[PDB]
Amino acid sequence: PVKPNYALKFTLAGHTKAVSSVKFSPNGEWLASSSADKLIKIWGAYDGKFEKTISGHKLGISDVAWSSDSNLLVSASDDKTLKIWDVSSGKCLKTLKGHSNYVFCCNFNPQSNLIVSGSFDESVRIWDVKTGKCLKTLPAHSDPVSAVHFNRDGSLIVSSSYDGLCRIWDTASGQCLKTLIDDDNPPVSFVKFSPNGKYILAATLDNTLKLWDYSKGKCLKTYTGHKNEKYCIFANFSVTGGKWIVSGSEDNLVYIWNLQTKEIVQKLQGHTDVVISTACHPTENIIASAALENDKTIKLWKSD
């Protein structure tokens, strides 16, 4: 298909404050959401049916991520901790303590024996899921860390920061394998490996998304037209149908670009506030989006 045609299917209400992140379970059956309301909510990915609320954090949550088998979840909160949850029971299995300020981002590695987190305390931490103890503390950046992501097999970790840098780390040793630098150094608000692990998608707060070939350290594509100079908005690689780049925007729309041509192929209208997060279903052409306080809802969209 030359251009997708996503249409609204469901509007999920429940959160009492701005929504912060939405993620589809790897098995595609669930959608998890975190919010400034200190809660995690689980929803049916196909019927949008509310499943349950997961509570425990003392302050707002900025991110949540799924384990490889869709059974566990990890959340990053302003209470300076991360918590690992058993999705089926809703119980907190462990509380990861170590950061000295807000925990902003988190992810499990493919094996899911590890969790990586980024905090306002300017560090990146690697944790042992089983024990809940901090294995490594990396002096990753000189400003708050906005994103952390493991590559395809978990051998690498990429981080982003308001310090204007994007760095690649060797998971095993914790050593910095590379630093992507810009001469204008605009804050990097988000970063993530491509499904192939060969490229990195990075957002800077100058309304720009870039596709990098980290190894060679060269920018291959740039996506513009959307609005992003204030918040750390998630971006995605959509691969179930055509190959697109999906991102939220500060103009209340969801942008979709053709990855190769960089042309905007569709803009999803409907939210009534900044679309801070978007996620792409693992097998179906389904997009999930979430907005800030004047909206507070999550929307599910589908095309084909």
């Binding site: 701005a18 707002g60 900025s62 902003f104 918040y231």
Partner: peptide, 5 residues
């Protein structure tokens, strides 16, 4: 506080 300022 990602939802924030």
């Amino acid at each position: 506080a990602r939802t924030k300022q």
